Amino acid sequence: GAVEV
Amino acid sequence: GAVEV
Amino acid sequence: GAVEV
Amino acid sequence: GAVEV
Amino acid sequence: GAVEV
Amino acid sequence: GAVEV
Amino acid sequence: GAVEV
Amino acid sequence: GAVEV
Amino acid sequence: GAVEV
Amino acid sequence: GAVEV
Amino acid sequence: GAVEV
Amino acid sequence: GAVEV
Amino acid sequence: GAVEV
Amino acid sequence: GAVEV
Amino acid sequence: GAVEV
Amino acid sequence: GAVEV
Amino acid sequence: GAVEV
Amino acid sequence: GAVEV
Amino acid sequence: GAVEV
Amino acid sequence: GAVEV
Amino acid sequence: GAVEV
Amino acid sequence: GAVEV
Amino acid sequence: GAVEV
Amino acid sequence: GAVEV
Amino acid sequence: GAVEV
Amino acid sequence: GAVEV
Amino acid sequence: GAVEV
Amino acid sequence: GAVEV
Amino acid sequence: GAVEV
Amino acid sequence: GAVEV
Amino acid sequence: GAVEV
Amino acid sequence: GAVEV
Amino acid sequence: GAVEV
Amino acid sequence: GAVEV
Amino acid sequence: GAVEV
Amino acid sequence: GAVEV
Amino acid sequence: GAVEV
Amino acid sequence: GAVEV
Amino acid sequence: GAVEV
Amino acid sequence: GAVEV
Amino acid sequence: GAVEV
Amino acid sequence: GAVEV
Amino acid sequence: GAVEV
Amino acid sequence: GAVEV
Amino acid sequence: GAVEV
Ligand SMILES: *C(=O)c1ccc(-c2ccc(-c3ccc(C(*)=O)cc3)s2)cc1
Ligand SMILES: *C(=O)c1ccc(-c2ccc(-c3ccc(C(*)=O)cc3)s2)cc1
Ligand SMILES: *C(=O)c1ccc(-c2ccc(-c3ccc(C(*)=O)cc3)s2)cc1
Ligand SMILES: *C(=O)c1ccc(-c2ccc(-c3ccc(C(*)=O)cc3)s2)cc1
Ligand SMILES: *C(=O)c1ccc(-c2ccc(-c3ccc(C(*)=O)cc3)s2)cc1
Ligand SMILES: *C(=O)c1ccc(-c2ccc(-c3ccc(C(*)=O)cc3)s2)cc1
Ligand SMILES: *C(=O)c1ccc(-c2ccc(-c3ccc(C(*)=O)cc3)s2)cc1
Ligand SMILES: *C(=O)c1ccc(-c2ccc(-c3ccc(C(*)=O)cc3)s2)cc1
Ligand SMILES: *C(=O)c1ccc(-c2ccc(-c3ccc(C(*)=O)cc3)s2)cc1
Ligand SMILES: *C(=O)c1ccc(-c2ccc(-c3ccc(C(*)=O)cc3)s2)cc1
Ligand SMILES: *C(=O)c1ccc(-c2ccc(-c3ccc(C(*)=O)cc3)s2)cc1
Ligand SMILES: *C(=O)c1ccc(-c2ccc(-c3ccc(C(*)=O)cc3)s2)cc1
Ligand SMILES: *C(=O)c1ccc(-c2ccc(-c3ccc(C(*)=O)cc3)s2)cc1
Ligand SMILES: *C(=O)c1ccc(-c2ccc(-c3ccc(C(*)=O)cc3)s2)cc1
Ligand SMILES: *C(=O)c1ccc(-c2ccc(-c3ccc(C(*)=O)cc3)s2)cc1
Ligand SMILES: *C(=O)c1ccc(-c2ccc(-c3ccc(C(*)=O)cc3)s2)cc1
Ligand SMILES: *C(=O)c1ccc(-c2ccc(-c3ccc(C(*)=O)cc3)s2)cc1
Ligand SMILES: *C(=O)c1ccc(-c2ccc(-c3ccc(C(*)=O)cc3)s2)cc1
Ligand SMILES: *C(=O)c1ccc(-c2ccc(-c3ccc(C(*)=O)cc3)s2)cc1
Ligand SMILES: *C(=O)c1ccc(-c2ccc(-c3ccc(C(*)=O)cc3)s2)cc1
Ligand SMILES: *C(=O)c1ccc(-c2ccc(-c3ccc(C(*)=O)cc3)s2)cc1
Ligand SMILES: *C(=O)c1ccc(-c2ccc(-c3ccc(C(*)=O)cc3)s2)cc1
Ligand SMILES: *C(=O)c1ccc(-c2ccc(-c3ccc(C(*)=O)cc3)s2)cc1
Ligand SMILES: *C(=O)c1ccc(-c2ccc(-c3ccc(C(*)=O)cc3)s2)cc1
Ligand SMILES: *C(=O)c1ccc(-c2ccc(-c3ccc(C(*)=O)cc3)s2)cc1
Ligand SMILES: *C(=O)c1ccc(-c2ccc(-c3ccc(C(*)=O)cc3)s2)cc1
Ligand SMILES: *C(=O)c1ccc(-c2ccc(-c3ccc(C(*)=O)cc3)s2)cc1
Ligand SMILES: *C(=O)c1ccc(-c2ccc(-c3ccc(C(*)=O)cc3)s2)cc1
Ligand SMILES: *C(=O)c1ccc(-c2ccc(-c3ccc(C(*)=O)cc3)s2)cc1
Ligand SMILES: *C(=O)c1ccc(-c2ccc(-c3ccc(C(*)=O)cc3)s2)cc1
């Protein structure tokens, strides 16, 4: 996945 | 998935 | 999926 | 799906 | 689906 | 689908 | 899917 | 999927 | 998937 | 996957 | 995977 | 979805 | 959906 | 839907 | 989804 | 258990 | 269990 | 357990 | 497991 | 496990 | 394990 | 345990 | 383990 | 997803 | 344990 | 282990 | 995902 | 233990 | 081990 | 993922 | 232990 | 071991 | 991942 | 121990 | 995965 | 070992 | 994998 | 990963 | 011990 | 994975 | 061993 | 793997 | 993996 | 692997 | 792995 912050 | 914050 | 916040 | 908040 | 809040 | 609470 | 809480 | 809380 | 909190 | 907190 | 905090 | 056993 | 066993 | 066993 | 055993 | 929604 | 909605 | 939503 | 007051 | 007041 | 006030 | 959401 | 006030 | 045992 | 979200 | 105020 | 035992 | 998110 | 105020 | 025992 | 996120 | 204020 | 025993 | 993130 | 910050 | 203010 | 904090 | 015993 | 991240 | 900061 | 202010 | 902090 | 900073 | 701090 | 700074 890809967590973006 | 992709969590966006 | 995609959770948006 | 897509949860929006 | 799509939950909106 | 869609479900709240 | 989509689920809140 | 998508799940919040 | 995607999950917050 | 993707998970925050 | 991906995990924050 | 939302399972509460 | 929403299962409450 | 909403199952309450 | 969201399992609360 | 004892589920109170 | 004992489900109170 | 004892789930209070 | 069972609910009370 | 069971819920109280 | 069980919930109280 | 004792889950309070 | 169980939750209190 | 989000398991709360 | 005693999970408070 | 159990949560308090 | 997010397991809270 | 005693998890407070 | 258990959480306090 | 994110295990909180 | 006593995990406060 | 346990957390305080 | 991220284990917090 | 006593983990505060 | 890929965490971005 | 336990955390304080 | 990928994990922050 | 990141173990915090 | 007493881990503060 | 790949953590970016 | 335990952490203080 | 990959881990920061 | 590869941590970049 | 890869770990910073 | 490879940490880059
Ligand atoms: C060999 O067995 C093998 C198996 C899996 C892989 C993967 C490379 C990237 C993967 C991945 C990317 C992004 C996400 C989230 O969006 C999840 C997994 S798996 C390589 C070699
Ligand atoms: C080899 O067996 C293999 C299997 C799976 C993969 C994946 C690469 C990216 C994946 C992914 C991306 C994004 C999301 C969320 O949106 C979930 C999974 S799986 C690579 C190699
Ligand atoms: C190889 O076996 C394989 C299987 C699945 C995948 C996926 C790439 C992205 C996926 C995904 C994206 C977004 C969402 C939510 O909207 C859910 C799943 S699965 C790659 C390779
Ligand atoms: C390979 O087997 C495979 C299977 C499924 C997928 C998916 C990519 C995105 C998906 C998805 C997106 C959005 C939602 C909610 O709206 C649910 C699922 S599944 C990729 C590869
Ligand atoms: C491959 O097998 C595969 C199967 C399903 C999918 C999906 C992509 C998005 C989906 C979806 C979107 C929105 C909702 C709610 O409105 C429910 C499902 S399923 C991709 C690939
Ligand atoms: C060994 O042969 C083998 C079997 C399974 C896998 C996986 C590839 C991608 C995986 C994955 C990544 C991210 C997520 C996020 O939820 C879920 C699954 S497992 C590799 C090698
Ligand atoms: C094996 O290949 C396999 C079997 C099942 C799955 C699932 C991914 C998400 C699932 C799910 C989503 C939502 C709910 C109600 O929340 C229940 C199950 S099953 C992946 C791979
Ligand atoms: C195997 O390939 C497989 C079997 C089932 C699934 C499911 C994903 C989500 C499911 C679901 C959603 C919502 C509800 C009522 O909430 C019940 C089940 S089943 C994925 C893959
Ligand atoms: C296998 O491919 C498979 C079988 C069933 C499913 C389901 C996804 C959501 C389902 C569902 C939604 C809502 C309700 C009443 O809430 C009951 C079931 S079944 C996915 C994949
Ligand atoms: C084996 O190859 C295999 C079997 C299952 C899986 C799953 C990845 C995510 C799953 C899932 C997502 C969401 C929910 C309700 O949250 C339940 C299960 S199962 C990967 C690989
Ligand atoms: C069909 O196999 C089937 C479905 C459910 C069950 C259950 C065994 C124990 C259950 C339960 C225990 C405790 C509580 C809360 O106090 C709620 C449900 S359901 C057996 C067989
Ligand atoms: C058809 O197989 C079938 C469907 C449900 C069941 C159940 C076994 C135990 C159940 C249950 C236990 C405890 C509580 C709450 O106190 C609620 C349901 S249902 C068996 C067979
Ligand atoms: C079908 O095999 C089946 C499904 C569930 C169960 C359960 C065994 C113990 C359960 C339970 C224990 C404690 C609490 C909270 O106090 C809630 C559920 S469910 C057995 C068999
Ligand atoms: C089906 O095998 C099955 C599913 C769950 C269980 C459980 C054993 C202990 C459980 C439990 C203990 C404590 C708490 C919180 O106080 C919640 C659940 S569930 C047995 C068999
Ligand atoms: C073996 O090859 C194998 C089996 C399972 C897996 C999984 C990677 C991520 C999984 C998962 C993601 C999300 C959720 C609900 O959060 C549950 C499970 S299973 C990888 C490799
Ligand atoms: C099915 O084997 C199964 C699933 C869970 C369990 C559990 C044993 C102890 C559990 C537990 C202990 C303490 C707390 C918090 O106070 C929460 C859960 S679950 C046994 C068997
Ligand atoms: C053996 O080859 C094997 C078995 C499982 C795995 C997994 C890598 C990541 C997994 C996972 C990701 C996310 C979640 C919910 O967060 C649960 C499990 S399993 C790798 C290699
Ligand atoms: C199934 O084997 C199974 C799953 C979990 C367990 C547990 C034993 C002790 C547990 C626990 C102790 C303390 C705390 C926090 O106070 C939380 C969980 S879970 C046994 C068997
Ligand atoms: C043996 O060859 C083997 C077995 C498992 C593994 C894993 C590497 C990362 C794993 C994992 C990642 C993320 C999560 C949820 O965070 C859980 C497990 S398992 C490598 C080699
Ligand atoms: C299944 O074997 C299983 C899983 C976990 C355990 C645990 C033994 C002690 C645990 C624990 C001690 C202290 C704290 C924080 O105060 C948290 C967890 S879990 C036994 C058996
Ligand atoms: C033996 O050959 C062997 C077994 C396991 C491993 C692992 C390397 C990294 C692992 C891992 C990464 C991430 C997480 C969740 O962070 C859990 C485990 S296992 C190497 C060699
Ligand atoms: C399954 O064998 C298992 C897993 C964990 C344990 C633990 C023994 C002591 C633990 C612990 C002590 C102190 C603190 C912080 O105060 C946190 C965890 S876990 C036993 C058995
Ligand atoms: C040989 O067995 C083997 C197995 C897996 C790999 C991987 C190279 C990159 C991987 C990966 C990239 C990105 C992500 C997240 O997006 C997850 C896994 S696995 C090499 C050699
Ligand atoms: C024996 O040949 C052997 C067994 C395990 C290993 C490992 C090298 C790195 C490992 C690891 C990396 C990351 C994490 C979560 O950070 C956990 C374990 S195990 C080498 C040689
Ligand atoms: C399973 O054998 C197992 C895992 C961990 C332990 C522990 C013994 C002492 C522990 C501990 C002491 C002090 C502190 C910080 O104050 C944190 C952890 S863990 C026993 C058995
Ligand atoms: C020989 O057994 C072997 C097995 C694995 C590898 C890998 C080289 C790079 C890997 C990797 C790259 C990036 C990521 C994250 O995105 C995860 C794993 S595994 C070499 C030789
Ligand atoms: C000895 O024969 C043996 C068995 C396993 C391995 C591994 C190669 C790459 C590994 C690894 C690197 C980085 C990460 C990050 O999470 C996880 C696993 S273990 C070498 C030699
Ligand atoms: C011989 O047994 C052996 C096993 C593993 C290796 C590896 C060379 C590079 C590796 C690696 C690169 C990058 C990453 C992160 O992205 C993780 C592992 S493993 C050499 C020889
Ligand atoms: C002896 O025969 C033996 C068994 C395992 C290994 C390993 C080769 C590469 C390893 C490794 C490097 C870096 C990382 C980062 O997380 C994980 C595993 S262990 C050598 C010799
Ligand atoms: C003989 O047993 C043996 C085993 C492992 C190796 C390795 C050479 C380079 C390795 C490595 C490179 C880079 C990374 C991170 O990206 C991790 C491991 S292992 C040589 C000889």
Side-chain angles (χ1 to χ4, degrees), chain f residues 1, chain g residues 5, chain h residues 1-2, chain j residues 1-2, chain l residues 5, chain m residues 1-3, chain o residues 1-2:
Chain g
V5 164
Chain l
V5 164
Chain m
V3 171

Side-chain angles (χ1 to χ4, degrees), chain W residues 1, chain Y residues 1-2, chain Z residues 1-2, chain a residues 5, chain b residues 1-2, chain c residues 1, chain d residues 5, chain e residues 1, chain g residues 5:
Chain a
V5 164
Chain d
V5 164
Chain g
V5 164

